[PDB]
């Protein structure tokens, strides 16, 4: 399975699954600062799933590693803002992160394999 391009639709389908998860709702849109006016003192680089889907559809990711870095930022940014490791939203982020890591592993493996095969000779 050496298709160098296959990651892109694979990542589109996984983002569709994440948007279907109730656990995604808080992380779907860029954080609103009216409810959280201190956010940009705590979080240097805001990220959300709509930004990730738009970046993908724009043709502005070169690899599934770059998309994975952005998605992991959504979860590190969630971990950075939680006052309690027993926060509802933080707990939502931990479950969605486990779901995401479970599904992205084959995408990364298949892509890195395809690129090694491309440079075999």
Ligand X SMILES: CC1=Nc2ccc(C(=O)N3CCN(C(=O)NC(C)(C)C)CC3)cc2C1(C)C
Tokens representing 107 are 């995408």
Q: Rule CB under 6 A: is residue 82 a binding residue for ligand X?
A: yes
Task: Give me the least distance between CB of 21 and ligand X, in Å please.
Answer: 15
Sign of the dihedral through C-alpha 108, 114, 117, 119:
negative
Cα 108 to Cα 81: distance, rounded to the nearest angstrom: 28
Tokens 């592993």 identify what position? 105
Q: Rule CB under 6 A: is residue 94 a binding residue for ligand X?
A: no
Cα 4 to Cα 16: distance, rounded to the nearest angstrom: 21
Nearest-Å Rg of the Cα atoms of the chain is 16
By beta-carbon proximity to ligand X, the closer residue of 5 and 45 is: 45
Please give the residues from 19 up to 48 whose contact with ligand X meets the rule CB under 6 A.
26-27, 31, 36, 38
From 87, 94, 99, 112, residue interacting with ligand X (rule: CB under 6 A): 87
Q: Rule CB under 6 A: is residue 89 a binding residue for ligand X?
A: yes
Task: Give me the least distance between CB of 33 and ligand X, in Å please.
Answer: 10
Cα 21 to Cα 111: distance, rounded to the nearest angstrom: 25
Q: Tell me if 4 sits within 8 A of 111, measured CB to CB.
A: yes
Task: Give me the least distance between CB of 85 and ligand X, in Å please.
Answer: 10
Task: Give me the least distance between CB of 82 and ligand X, in Å please.
Answer: 4
Give me the residues that bind ligand X (CB under 6 A), please: 26-27, 31, 36, 38, 78, 81-83, 87, 89-90
């Amino acid at each position: 399975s050496y298709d160098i391009q296959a990651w892109k639709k694979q990542c589109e389908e996984l983002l569709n699954l994440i948007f279907q998860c109730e656990d995604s709702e808080p992380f779907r849109q860029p954080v609103d600062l009216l409810e959280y006016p201190d956010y940009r003192d705590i979080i240097d680089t805001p990220m959300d799933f709509a930004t990730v889907r738009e970046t993908l559809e724009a043709g502005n990711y070169e690899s599934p590693m770059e998309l994975c870095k952005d998605v992991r930022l959504i979860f590190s940014n969630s971990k950075a803002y939680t006052p309690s490791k027993r926060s509802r939203i933080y707990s939502m982020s931990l479950r969605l992160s486990a779901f995401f890591e479970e599904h992205i592993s084959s995408v990364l493996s298949d892509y890195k394999s395809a690129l090694r095969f491309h440079k075999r000779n």
